[PDB]
Every structure is written in structure tokens, then in C-alpha cells.
């Protein structure tokens, strides 16, 4: 769904770094993922 | 605390071994800890 909308970045809990990599590589082309666990991380990957 | 979930895992591993037997290459599957992530994939929990 994020691919359909033209999204070009995405942020997921680090605990799902597993499942996201099961997907076929063509599905994952063109995204730029940022796994994270503690919330402070996200604050620095959105605003600045 | 229950054993039901581990029962699911060991089941999965075994039947995948059967698939390596009946058509695959090895005549005798030998699970090893280094081998395991192949059969059952990536770790789920870590950060207890």
C-alpha cells in the first residue's frame, strides 16, 4: 500500500526487520527503509 | 510459559526436512544451529 501511494521512505519497529526482508526484491525496489526501536530515533529521521 | 508454541516450531522444522529428503539433495538432514536460520528463518524475539 505504501508503494501505491508513491511513498519514498518508511519507518518500522526494528523487531520486524525480519519479515520485511522476506518480500521479493522487486517489491522492495525504490524504498528507503529506516528500522528503529527507541522513539528518539524517529524524531531525528523526520524533522531535521 | 506453555509448550504449545515450541511444538509448532519443531513440527515445522521436521516437515521441511521431509521436503529435503523426498526430492531434494540430502539423504539425511542434519540440523545444526548455524544451519537453522535456513529452515525456520530469522530470529523473532531478541530484546527481552
From Swiss-Prot, chain B:
Q: Which residues cross the membrane?
A: none
Q: What is this protein's tissue specificity according to the annotation?
A: Duodenum, heart, lung and liver, but not thymus.
What superkingdom heads the lineage?
Eukaryota
**Residues in the signal sequence:** none
Q: Where in the cell is it found?
A: Mitochondrion matrix
> How does the entry describe the domains?
The Lon N-terminal domains are crucial for the overall structure of the protein, maintaining it in a conformation allowing its proper functioning.
Give the quaternary structure.
Homohexamer. Organized in a ring with a central cavity. The ATP-binding and proteolytic domains (AP-domain) form a hexameric chamber, while the N-terminal domain is arranged as a trimer of dimers. DNA and RNA binding is stimulated by substrate and inhibited by ATP binding. Interacts with TWNK and mitochondrial DNA polymerase subunit POLG.
User: What family does the database annotate?
Assistant: Belongs to the peptidase S16 family.
Its function, per the record, reads:
ATP-dependent serine protease that mediates the selective degradation of misfolded, unassembled or oxidatively damaged polypeptides as well as certain short-lived regulatory proteins in the mitochondrial matrix. Endogenous substrates include mitochondrial steroidogenic acute regulatory (StAR) protein, DELE1, helicase Twinkle (TWNK) and the large ribosomal subunit protein MRPL32/bL32m. MRPL32/bL32m is protected from degradation by LONP1 when it is bound to a nucleic acid (RNA), but TWNK is not. May also have a chaperone function in the assembly of inner membrane protein complexes.
Q: Which disease is it linked to?
A: CODAS syndrome: A rare syndrome characterized by the combination of cerebral, ocular, dental, auricular, and skeletal features. These include developmental delay, craniofacial anomalies, cataracts, ptosis, median nasal groove, delayed tooth eruption, hearing loss, short stature, delayed epiphyseal ossification, metaphyseal hip dysplasia, and vertebral coronal clefts.
Q: What's the protein here called? A: Lon protease homolog, mitochondrial
The organism encoding this protein is Homo sapiens
Question: What range of the intact protein is shown?
Answer: 707 to 754 of 959
